[PDB]
Motif scaffolding. Structure first.
Motif, short mmCIF file in Angstrom:
data_model
loop_
_atom_site.label_atom_id
_atom_site.label_comp_id
_atom_site.label_asym_id
_atom_site.label_seq_id
_atom_site.Cartn_x
_atom_site.Cartn_y
_atom_site.Cartn_z
N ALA A 12 66.57 -52.58 83.09
CA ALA A 12 66.91 -51.17 82.89
C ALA A 12 65.96 -50.23 83.60
N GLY A 13 66.49 -49.50 84.58
CA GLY A 13 65.70 -48.54 85.35
C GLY A 13 64.95 -49.17 86.52
N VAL A 14 65.24 -50.44 86.80
CA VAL A 14 64.62 -51.17 87.91
C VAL A 14 65.70 -51.86 88.75
N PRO A 86 80.50 -44.79 82.16
CA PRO A 86 80.81 -45.73 83.24
C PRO A 86 79.63 -46.64 83.51
N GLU A 87 79.86 -47.95 83.57
CA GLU A 87 78.76 -48.92 83.62
C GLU A 87 77.78 -48.59 84.74
N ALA A 88 76.50 -48.61 84.40
CA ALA A 88 75.43 -48.27 85.33
C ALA A 88 75.48 -49.10 86.59
N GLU A 89 75.10 -48.46 87.68
CA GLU A 89 75.19 -49.08 88.98
C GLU A 89 73.81 -49.50 89.47
N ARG A 90 73.74 -50.02 90.68
CA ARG A 90 72.49 -50.61 91.14
C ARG A 90 71.49 -49.55 91.53
N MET A 91 70.23 -49.82 91.20
CA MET A 91 69.12 -49.05 91.72
C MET A 91 69.02 -49.28 93.24
N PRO A 92 69.13 -48.20 94.05
CA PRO A 92 69.08 -48.32 95.51
C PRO A 92 67.78 -48.99 95.93
N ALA A 166 52.09 -64.19 89.65
CA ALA A 166 53.23 -63.31 89.43
C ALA A 166 52.92 -61.82 89.54
N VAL A 167 53.97 -61.02 89.75
CA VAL A 167 53.91 -59.55 89.75
C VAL A 167 55.03 -59.01 88.86
N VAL A 168 54.79 -57.88 88.20
CA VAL A 168 55.82 -57.24 87.39
C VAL A 168 56.30 -55.92 88.02
N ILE A 169 57.62 -55.76 88.15
CA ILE A 169 58.18 -54.48 88.55
C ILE A 169 58.68 -53.78 87.30
N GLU A 170 58.04 -52.66 86.98
CA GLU A 170 58.37 -51.88 85.79
C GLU A 170 58.60 -50.39 86.12
N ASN A 171 59.18 -49.64 85.18
CA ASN A 171 59.51 -48.22 85.39
C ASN A 171 59.13 -47.32 84.22
N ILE A 187 53.37 -53.52 89.17
CA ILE A 187 53.80 -52.42 90.02
C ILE A 187 54.76 -51.50 89.27
N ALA A 188 54.45 -50.21 89.25
CA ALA A 188 55.33 -49.22 88.64
C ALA A 188 56.24 -48.53 89.66
N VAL A 189 57.50 -48.32 89.27
CA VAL A 189 58.48 -47.63 90.09
C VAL A 189 59.07 -46.49 89.25
N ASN A 190 58.82 -45.25 89.67
CA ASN A 190 59.06 -44.11 88.79
C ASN A 190 60.46 -43.54 88.93
N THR A 191 61.39 -44.18 88.23
CA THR A 191 62.82 -43.91 88.38
C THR A 191 63.34 -42.93 87.34
N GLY A 192 62.44 -42.31 86.57
CA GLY A 192 62.85 -41.31 85.58
C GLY A 192 62.22 -39.94 85.76
N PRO A 193 62.17 -39.14 84.67
CA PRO A 193 61.63 -37.78 84.75
C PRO A 193 60.14 -37.65 84.41
N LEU A 194 59.48 -38.75 84.03
CA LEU A 194 58.09 -38.68 83.59
C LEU A 194 57.11 -38.54 84.75
N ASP A 195 55.93 -38.00 84.44
CA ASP A 195 54.83 -37.90 85.39
C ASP A 195 54.32 -39.29 85.73
N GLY A 196 54.07 -39.53 87.03
CA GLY A 196 53.49 -40.79 87.52
C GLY A 196 52.17 -41.19 86.87
N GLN A 197 51.40 -40.18 86.44
CA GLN A 197 50.18 -40.36 85.67
C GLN A 197 50.38 -41.10 84.34
N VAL A 198 51.57 -40.96 83.74
CA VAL A 198 51.88 -41.65 82.48
C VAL A 198 52.00 -43.17 82.71
N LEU A 199 52.50 -43.56 83.88
CA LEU A 199 52.60 -44.98 84.26
C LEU A 199 51.23 -45.57 84.63
#
Ligand SMILES: [Cl-]
Ligand SMILES: [Mg+2]
Length: 223
Positions: A12-14, A86-92, A166-171, A187-199
């Motif tokens: 979800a969100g990745v 409508p069912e969520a689509e792929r993260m570009p 291993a590596v983790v891709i999270e959002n 690794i964080a990927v900021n796909t929402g409205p939050l500040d990058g500092q929160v990640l």
């Protein structure tokens, strides 16, 4: 990244853009029950089990634990709101990144708290040849959700992997916490409205604004 063997993807969100749907569903279900959970607050609580998010809201405002019956009914109401979108689509970039990951000889893994039936085949439709049953962690595998590290620890166990392989891709801040607490480079990927500092506060090693940008910068990340 010579020690590296696998990439642990949150869903979800990745992989899929489902968080506009989750955060609105949660805000709306609580609002209907006379309860205040904002969309931003829902984003802050991404990766929690339904039982966790509901308990937090209940203890804060009502001064009570949420019962098991109250959990299932609120979670089912939230599920109805979610499913009416409508069912969520792929993260570009996710498919392109997965291509790079696999071509590198790395093992793509998926980690989620979702209890969806028919998940593998959905993942197979959307990302052909990427994911495998034996290398999936879902709701049926673990008790707790984020920020508990257990899902990612389960992912290492099922992969036959150390933390350094291993590596983790999270959002999501709580998800990032779970990955960092599991001793895994996150690794964080900021796909929402939050500040990058929160990640970053949550323990993220790297920070990218989208899945595409991570994909573009992938061969310039060293471990
Ligand atoms: Cl999703
Ligand atoms: Mg997420």
């Amino acid at each position: 990244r010579k020690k590296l063997k696998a990439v642990l993807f949150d869903m979800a969100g990745v992989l899929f853009n489902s968080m506009p749907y989750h955060s609105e569903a949660w805000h709306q279900v609580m609002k209907t029950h006379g309860l205040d959970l904002s969309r931003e607050e829902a984003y802050m609580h991404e990766g929690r089990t339904g039982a966790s998010t509901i308990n937090i809201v209940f203890q804060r405002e009502l001064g009570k634990e949420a019962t098991q019956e109250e959990i299932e009914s609120i979670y089912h109401e939230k599920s109805i709101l979610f499913n009416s979108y409508p069912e969520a689509e792929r993260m570009p970039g996710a498919w392109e990144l997965l291509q790079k990951v696999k071509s590198e000889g790395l093992t793509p893994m998926v980690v989620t708290g979702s209890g969806q039936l028919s998940l593998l085949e959905r993942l197979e439709h959307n990302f052909p040849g990427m994911f495998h049953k034996e290398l999936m962690v879902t709701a049926f595998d673990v008790k707790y959700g984020k920020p508990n590290p257990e899902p990612y620890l389960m992912a290492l166990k099922k992969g036959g992997l150390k933390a350094d392989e291993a590596v983790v891709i999270e959002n999501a801040p709580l998800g990032v916490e779970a990955g960092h607490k599991a001793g895994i480079f996150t690794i964080a990927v900021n796909t929402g409205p939050l500040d990058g500092q929160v990640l970053l506060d949550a323990g993220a090693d790297l920070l990218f604004p989208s899945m595409q940008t991570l994909c573009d910068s992938w061969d310039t990340i060293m471990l």
